[PDB]
Amino acid sequence: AGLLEGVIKEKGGVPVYPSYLAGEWGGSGQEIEVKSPIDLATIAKVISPSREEVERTLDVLFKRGRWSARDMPGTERLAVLRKAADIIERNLDVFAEVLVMNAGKPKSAAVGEVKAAVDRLRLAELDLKKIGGDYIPGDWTYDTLETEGLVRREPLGVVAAITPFNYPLFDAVNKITYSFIYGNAVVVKPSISDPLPAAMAVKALLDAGFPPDAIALLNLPGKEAEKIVADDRVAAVSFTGSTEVGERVVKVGGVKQYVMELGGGDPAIVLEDADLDLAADKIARGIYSYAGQRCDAIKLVLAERPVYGKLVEEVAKRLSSLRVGDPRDPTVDVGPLISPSAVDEMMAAIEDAVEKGGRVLAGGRRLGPTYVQPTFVEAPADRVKDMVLYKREVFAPVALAVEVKDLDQAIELANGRPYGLDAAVFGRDVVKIRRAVRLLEVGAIYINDMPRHGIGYYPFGGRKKSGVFREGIGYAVEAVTAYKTIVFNYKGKGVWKYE
Amino acid sequence: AGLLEGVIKEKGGVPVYPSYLAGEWGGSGQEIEVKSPIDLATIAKVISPSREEVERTLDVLFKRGRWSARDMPGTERLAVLRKAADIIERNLDVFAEVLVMNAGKPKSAAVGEVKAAVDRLRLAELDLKKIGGDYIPGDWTYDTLETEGLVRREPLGVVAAITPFNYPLFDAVNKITYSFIYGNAVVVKPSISDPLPAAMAVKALLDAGFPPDAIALLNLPGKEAEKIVADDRVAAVSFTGSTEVGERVVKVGGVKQYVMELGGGDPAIVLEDADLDLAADKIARGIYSYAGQRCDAIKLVLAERPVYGKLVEEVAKRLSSLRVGDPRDPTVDVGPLISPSAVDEMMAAIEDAVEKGGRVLAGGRRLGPTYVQPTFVEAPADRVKDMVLYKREVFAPVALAVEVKDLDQAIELANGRPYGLDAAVFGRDVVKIRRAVRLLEVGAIYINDMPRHGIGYYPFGGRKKSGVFREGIGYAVEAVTAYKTIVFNYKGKGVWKYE
Amino acid sequence: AGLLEGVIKEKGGVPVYPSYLAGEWGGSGQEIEVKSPIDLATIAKVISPSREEVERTLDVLFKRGRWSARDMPGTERLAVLRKAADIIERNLDVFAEVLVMNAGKPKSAAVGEVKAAVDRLRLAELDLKKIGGDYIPGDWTYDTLETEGLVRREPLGVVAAITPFNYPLFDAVNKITYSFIYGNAVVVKPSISDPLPAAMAVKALLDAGFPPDAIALLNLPGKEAEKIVADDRVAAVSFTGSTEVGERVVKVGGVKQYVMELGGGDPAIVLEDADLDLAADKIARGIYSYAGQRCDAIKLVLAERPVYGKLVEEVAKRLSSLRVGDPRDPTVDVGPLISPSAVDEMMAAIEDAVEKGGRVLAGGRRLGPTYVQPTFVEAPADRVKDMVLYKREVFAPVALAVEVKDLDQAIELANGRPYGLDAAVFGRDVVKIRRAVRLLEVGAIYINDMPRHGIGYYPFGGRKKSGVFREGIGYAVEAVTAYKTIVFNYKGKGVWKYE
Amino acid sequence: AGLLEGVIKEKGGVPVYPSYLAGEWGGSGQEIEVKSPIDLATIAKVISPSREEVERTLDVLFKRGRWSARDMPGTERLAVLRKAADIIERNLDVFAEVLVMNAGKPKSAAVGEVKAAVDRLRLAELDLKKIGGDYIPGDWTYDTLETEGLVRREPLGVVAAITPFNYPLFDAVNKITYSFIYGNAVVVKPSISDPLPAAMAVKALLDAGFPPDAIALLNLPGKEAEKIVADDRVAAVSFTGSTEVGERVVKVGGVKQYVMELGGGDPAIVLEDADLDLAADKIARGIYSYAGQRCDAIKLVLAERPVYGKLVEEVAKRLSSLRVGDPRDPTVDVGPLISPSAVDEMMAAIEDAVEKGGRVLAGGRRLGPTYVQPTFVEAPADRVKDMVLYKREVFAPVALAVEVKDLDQAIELANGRPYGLDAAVFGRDVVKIRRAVRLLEVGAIYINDMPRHGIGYYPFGGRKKSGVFREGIGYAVEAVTAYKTIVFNYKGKGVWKYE
Numbered sequence A, B, C, D: 001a002g003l004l005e006g007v008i009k010e011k012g013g014v015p016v017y018p019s020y021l022a023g024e025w026g027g028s029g030q031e032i033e034v035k036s037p038i039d040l041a042t043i044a045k046v047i048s049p050s051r052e053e054v055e056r057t058l059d060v061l062f063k064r065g066r067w068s069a070r071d072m073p074g075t076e077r078l079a080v081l082r083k084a085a086d087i088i089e090r091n092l093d094v095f096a097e098v099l100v101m102n103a104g105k106p107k108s109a110a111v112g113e114v115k116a117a118v119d120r121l122r123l124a125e126l127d128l129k130k131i132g133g134d135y136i137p138g139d140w141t142y143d144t145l146e147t148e149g150l151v152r153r154e155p156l157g158v159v160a161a162i163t164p165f166n167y168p169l170f171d172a173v174n175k176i177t178y179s180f181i182y183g184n185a186v187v188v189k190p191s192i193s194d195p196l197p198a199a200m201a202v203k204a205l206l207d208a209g210f211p212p213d214a215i216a217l218l219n220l221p222g223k224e225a226e227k228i229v230a231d232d233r234v235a236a237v238s239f240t241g242s243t244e245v246g247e248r249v250v251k252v253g254g255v256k257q258y259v260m261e262l263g264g265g266d267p268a269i270v271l272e273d274a275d276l277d278l279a280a281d282k283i284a285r286g287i288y289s290y291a292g293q294r295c296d297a298i299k300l301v302l303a304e305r306p307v308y309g310k311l312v313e314e315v316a317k318r319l320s321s322l323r324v325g326d327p328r329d330p331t332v333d334v335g336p337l338i339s340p341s342a343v344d345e346m347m348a349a350i351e352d353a354v355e356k357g358g359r360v361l362a363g364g365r366r367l368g369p370t371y372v373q374p375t376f377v378e379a380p381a382d383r384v385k386d387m388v389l390y391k392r393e394v395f396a397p398v399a400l401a402v403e404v405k406d407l408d409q410a411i412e413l414a415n416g417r418p419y420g421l422d423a424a425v426f427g428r429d430v431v432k433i434r435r436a437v438r439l440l441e442v443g444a445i446y447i448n449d450m451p452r453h454g455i456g457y458y459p460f461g462g463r464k465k466s467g468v469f470r471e472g473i474g475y476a477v478e479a480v481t482a483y484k485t486i487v488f489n490y491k492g493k494g495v496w497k498y499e
């Protein structure tokens, strides 16, 4: 409908979304059902490409795509992205509706993602801040005298953008934007569970003038994508997902430029001098936002003895005063989780914590195949490390609360999980803050706020199991671009007179 | 002897070099013979560590190494490196002798490598040019108003430095320098065929004060190293080697920060307006230097019709007027190749070129198990692409000569090999040069000079099969360092008044 | 009319433009006539402010202006500039008409300036590339251990933008843009000879939402402006004008941040390997464009013996085939000069050159009080240096042609004038080009093109008598901004453990 | 003696130091007596150059100096500076003795300055961090398509370094270092009151190989220097001194690149959450160090009601427990002031403060023509602004103490003086600190430490009356260097295919 006018095929009741094969929308591979977490019903179908079509798509992106993307001057790429922003913006409601239906995202959360995608597109201009090379004079070494060097960046060619389910619209728009702004062609591979927003975005981009042979959207399920990652024409792979899949991706890909945003949870530390209202409010939000289905969600709260009581109490009040329902009621605070499987795991993890000495302070009640109350489990420092909610990432609205003696204990506990994406610290003392910033092994630390990557105005990425490299405005250039050095030799040519 | 005073064990005639286990020199694993390519004789032995020692070494580097390297202020790390430079410099002759004997490197070439290693150490100060973070103000987006960001770099922890045989001293010193200057611990794994210089370098570094638990040298053969690369305590892997091993390394390593210098040959392009004396001289040198056992060696020469004759003729004269012998005679220009196996391949490749229409213009005669004449094979443009000397990298003193109609043919031929390390272009016209610089898919282009990475004053690395990422003074920081973002929230705190 | 709706006062026949006093349009000082160079007729009048109003305007800009400009977040400043671009763009024809009438600018040249002003405003986003501070860690010196540093930029406060007559619209828009984008208030002082475009631009900016107390436009004549420059509330002075006035400005201003674009002519060098069609075409244009009333105009042509003949001949053909008339006929190539005084000087300078051995190769005929033929005077190298057309800048469509033996003579002659704004060099050889780039003492060198600052996509400014500092997208930040260093002390606070 | 072996002329009892005239030590102008503030005795004499010698020196620096400095590759300039560091270091005691005798500097303070000068010289390598140009691609604007830009820095030529009396050794070494490291020649003009250290430093530099025609040391008194500043061959003027002289310097110099470090005092703010021991200790030191003859000396202390009592009390104890004597006793804490005139002013200023409601809390007693007790005067907020000790900079060991209600009052008082060099803030709360950092109009803010420029590891400079631009490692490049832009035109040359 609308954007996907002549694209969506209305086959026997359910709308069928085809893959975009770098030139034409189509696909002759298996058809796959797409369901809503709101009622487990099949809301549409997607056509996956055949091995022959995947192969043909890659051949196109590699042979023509790289050149039409690279040979379109930046000023036009910028215009394409801005026009794509205009198109998505006027279709805001439709984009939002699909997010609410397909991802079970609360209405306002879905509207936020569309706006984030629109802004990312419009701010492509800011990505230019990291454009420009280095001039290296050669008279600072005898061996390089009368020599000179120029270093600049060049697009790698074809970038594979693999995307998660929790931000089906933004991640696709993001990776496409930074890959394309520098001159690359892109193969987008969305989560097969909610590939509709990506299809809509790509259509808006194509309508905006995005070189038709420089982009692709393949509805491939899981391991079917390995075919793309393992191919030599794919010079870079931008992957946002789970640690386990990310690992499999590199082992399949081999030598190549990578950006691995592998998430995991995020710990939050509250110091005795923190504004507890701000902290309680922000931590509660960081715990339940989009049913905790955020990589930058808060999964552990560590508070110093003196404020632990109030803090945990306040966060508990907030979490239980939440309304869990269908994402449509602008009254509902929390919608469903992407699958009943996800809820099972959350329940199991809560039982595990309880068995190991944990006590539920809020939530805990499952309300349906895909509905649960955001839960807050208190745990003694001496037992938390063996709890599943600690050792692992339970993608759900659930966090642990742990009392700590001082900053050092907070820090060692915060660093005790295998991940290191972000960390939040609420407090006022510059010294304690500086110490925490140095010792927290994470890609980013949020001072007096909950972790929120937003559109990447500030760069983010992981450490430890959370991955490698960063995404951000300007910073993502390092992942879809390679350096090119030009060394000029003027030895004895009389440019310099011994210097 | 000297540096390796109480380290080398004189066991029944041949000196035995032990591995350095992050604290003590030792090893209780198999012993391996080290031979000279000059006479196939066993000149020494190296003790490899046992699985238990490898494991224990990693535990040390990870638990104590990262902290003693990171907690040694930069000013002291700098002093350590400078003192290490002094030590190697006064032991220049001994270092050189081992290179000549162990790697078959011509005396002056071995002396050059020692001096390169000394300079790299002394210029660690220049690596600081890429130290410093970014301050990102937040009033350039409504969502980030009254917000602020700081981005800086942090050492990853433990870096594994895997090294090739052709620059056994420099590569080890290089990777150790840039890994350590930023606060990392290092596990060095030298080629098991010539691990002596690395052992000497590490000793000089340890003598200079390099934190004893922050460095390691393991004499592990090939696949025995996979154990190190696959370990989670190894946050980065700096690998310089063949495309094939590099690929295996990443597939074993998984998600991690990588620098892959995978070589391959380098094409050289001569334009009709080039200074043929300079070009002939530089190309000849780029072909035979260290028996072509240089990743940045010239493997293909492409000259435009009008100068092709003179050029090829002059380069042929130069190559055949070369003296091939024992690397010791300062009179010998070319020493042996690292193994008879290497010579076999060169011979096979020359026969292949000849069978496919190629003609030998210089050299071609094998002089012994590990000795050969640097060879120059002319080939018609219409047949060169299927020749082994073209499709592959024959690590030996051998290059192809191909006449071309114009710049575009030179460029497509130059880009026709699977590699893309460097490329040389000799000419004068800025337009033709600019075109070639844009279209040559290589990490670096050398204008009017032969490709020579030197000590990395200018950054270098590959494209296509030549690998990913770069090494260089200042630039290598990006491979052994990770970003850390600190976002400060002052919303409503009165720092700004709506701005 | 239109923009200046309720602003322009229709007093007895001629439209009267008032000054903008940081809040209200007005002025109670002397009225001054504004004439057209097309017919010496009074086309309007401007109201200059009284000493009391100047004083009051400064008090406003300083006390309220700095804060309303600084406290308007960048994202809004950007919106203001973009909206101002929209307003000027829809009023393109009116803006152009005033330029043609008030400055005698050829229709297409006037249209170009309006478009340049619109683009400058729209690209303010690119100025952000030089936004961001430096983080300086302190462990690289013993004295600074456990210490840390942050360096960033801060707006100076009130910037005085003084403008020339030859780009009455662009210079005003330019200085206002870069001054405002970083948070400064601005006092614009246009040339009293053509202050109408500035008034229109300021109105478009005010309509766009530019903080009303953060900007000012004072119609002050020459020395009347000294009052502004000498004031302590004016933290920076951005001056584009003649060397002589610039000098007086600093001597009146004292200690303050300055940008002095003082022009002078530009020499052009043609090498024997240059494309003479390109060179002839570009040099001819650089000589006559806007009647040579461009600071980056070509005033001297130096060609090597072998191409000198053709080149000079071709440029002569082009200059004489030019149509001189009223700037309105899109058929006229060259309009009038800003004043009859300017033509007198050009005539005197041509006679001087002739008396000193020069020969006219094209032009030379005066056609009216303010009309002349763009002139090309050939001069022997041994006599050119004493000619007025060489030693001085004759702001008119006139250049000298000098034959030279080689590059070195071209370079010494090019460096022989007292100025050093830009220089053009046409040729192909990288070596000769590199030499010329190193030895030409000018702010910018244009390779194979005529000097053209455009909107400052590339930064420009002078050397020698041409001034100091630079203007450009991103670069101008250095002139209206100051550094602020924050040094944090954590000595003995346990952030670091000796490091 | 020693360094000044054949330089110092022993004329009738007192050693006579000649000026260095860019090639030979000499001078045929008036002789001037140099006295010690320790006993008002004439300890030596300096020979000033004659107008003819000044003129000849400038001609040399301009015609040969710029080229021998610029044509000495950086690697050698670096060696010169390092060798100069070695020479000064072995002559440490002699250098220190002259400082103690000639400047009345306490033994340990004099030793610190020599060590600072040695380090500055040795760290010249760090100044390279800001070396390197920018490559600007042209496809981000239609007008600049197929165009390209390179921006780099170039030395200005001859830099005039004018120096104060309070750091006669360091300032001279500093300005010489950053001016020379980039390729400039230098004219040093030391304070005629203590020009001996400069002479010694220049000798050490000349001995180290500093191009003999690229440096000069002229013993000119005050206005005699104007001759240098006003000259066109002097492209930049690096001046550290009083606001009043700085102003005169620019008005005499005209258009030129400037760095004006004009000092003034520094306010210190203590927040209720500050570590009062640290603050008391650091503020006391910032007040008395070198008899307050430091531009970064603390002249005003502002403490919040709750800690004001303890703080002021503790600082008073510290100041009065100080030993005032001859700088030689390593037991003496405070030596004399440079002149009896300076003490008179301090006394007058203290009486003024007292008359206006101020009360002395420590010191106040003059002990001789050039000796005084470091004084601490308490003043009510409602009267301090009219006190001389507030409105002006009394170069002496004297500061005001003012109780304030909150941060905003502290900030407005701190910003109330006409200067804005540095500011210190002691406290712990990030919010209050961030606010103070934003609103303090000074070049640098020191958090939890006294203001101390040191060797400029962190850049510093003024705002308001404290001057313009910055000095620092890396940052000073902006003052003795100019940009050079090279724009290459490839329009229609086939480098790009519409991009």
Ligand SMILES: NC(=O)c1ccc[n+]([C@@H]2O[C@H](COP(=O)([O-])OP(=O)(O)OC[C@H]3O[C@@H](n4cnc5c(N)ncnc54)[C@H](OP(=O)(O)O)[C@@H]3O)[C@@H](O)[C@H]2O)c1
Residues within 6 Å of the ligand: B162, B163, B164, B165, B166, B167, B189, B190, B191, B192, B193, B220, B221, B222, B223, B224, B225, B226, B229, B240, B241, B242, B243, B245, B246, B248, B249, B260, B261, B262, B263, B264, B294, B295, B296, B393, B395, B421, B461, B462, B466, B467
């Ligand atoms: N791109 C550049 O900048 C650059 C620079 C220099 C050389 N090169 C290239 O690299 C090659 C260097 O010579 P080389 O013959 O020694 O090549 P190589 O065999 O690929 O060198 C491999 C290094 O990796 C180790 N290794 C082998 N198998 C491994 C495994 N499975 N897991 C982990 N590590 C393993 C090797 O140890 P063992 O000795 O025990 O096998 C050796 O230290 C040449 O092809 C050259 O073109 C590239």
Ligand code: NA
Residues within 6 Å of the ligand: A230, A252, A253, A254, A255, B247
């Ligand atoms: Na692969």
Ligand code: NA
Residues within 6 Å of the ligand: A247, B230, B252, B253, B254, B255
């Ligand atoms: Na792994």
Ligand code: NA
Residues within 6 Å of the ligand: C230, C252, C253, C254, C255, D247
């Ligand atoms: Na002034």
Ligand code: NA
Residues within 6 Å of the ligand: C247, D230, D252, D253, D254, D255
């Ligand atoms: Na002047």
